[model samples]
Target: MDPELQCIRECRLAQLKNNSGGTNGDRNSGANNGGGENSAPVGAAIANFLEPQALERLSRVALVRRDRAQAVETYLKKLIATNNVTHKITEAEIVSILNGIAKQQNSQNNSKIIFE
Candidate 1:
């Protein structure tokens, strides 16, 4: 794998290790605590690789809607697959992608504003 993907995999391994508290049973037990489908796994890797300011912005999106974090990961993965990403993607690029996704989502919702 290229260095970027390799780095993400290594970061994921580190998170799994940390989440398990150095024990396999801990991770497995934690997984069972959730519902049928597990939560997204890419957040930890994204957090590890993203610049500090970018992560702060992403945290704000997550604060607005936790699922948006997963959407960010999906966008990043698409960029990676299309070779549009380099070893170190910048905060601006991350935010730009995020803003596009947000715009698309907002347009789809099509909510209207009325003056009070």
Candidate 2:
């Protein structure tokens, strides 16, 4: 496996060993009886990978879709490189960004579009 995956696996093992402190029944149980400490470290790891703007966007979207009521963290930095078009960003701009990311991924993988 790649170094990133390997590191994650190692971290998981460490979390399981060091932080997962609970009874055997609790370990097998589906309840959140334990795992506060373990979950905190893992959650920190997840937060490290997410861009602040992306996380805010995700939280806003989740609130609309899942009836989730929560305050999003204020990330003081912008995520996009270009913001010269200083008017409000419309849905078309959002779609453009999405399609641009898809195109870049496809090109990186050397995938060609052969559709009508």
Candidate 3:
């Protein structure tokens, strides 16, 4: 195999290790480095806009739908990039956002056009 191909393979594996907090070998040990929970932080923007009850509601949603909530935490910053704020958002409002997500997803399904 070419040395360049070997370099690319090693580079990709090393990059995956950092994102996942290391692979199976380190699974039972120091991956819990105090605050590495859930692949770590981007909460500066998230906390900035959320009210206390809204924060609590998001935690409950995180419990119910783990993956979606993590992605929600990520894209929450995309709004922070908009650098705009109006109010400390509330629980109903948090549900409101999640509902909007579901609506968009359902709209993409193919069952809505049978008008015969």
Q: In TM-score terms, which candidate is top?
A: 3
Q: Estimate each model's TM-score.
A: 0.42, 0.25, 0.45
- Please write out the lDDT profile of model 1 over residues 32-59, one tens digit for every residue: 4433476654545445567878767777
List the candidate 1 regions with Cα displacement exceeding 4 Å: 1-48, 106-116
User: Model 3: how far is 2 from its true place, Å?
Assistant: 29
Show where candidate 2 strays beyond 4 Å.
Answer: 18-54, 59-99, 106-116
How do all the candidates rank in terms of TM-score, highest first? 3, 1, 2
> Residue 2 in candidate 2 has what lDDT?
57
Model 2: per-residue Cα lDDT at residue 41:
57
> Please, what are the lDDT tens digits per residue for candidate 2 over residues 19-92?
44655554664656545554455445435445556555545554553211111121111322233323333334
Model 3: CA > 4 A from native: 1-45, 106-116
Model 2 Cα shift for residue 68 (angstroms): 22
lDDT of 3 by residue, 25-79 (tens): 7466543445544654455545767778788888998787644554455445555
Q: The CA-based lDDT of model 1 is what?
A: 0.60
Stretch of 10 with least lDDT, candidate 3 = 107-116
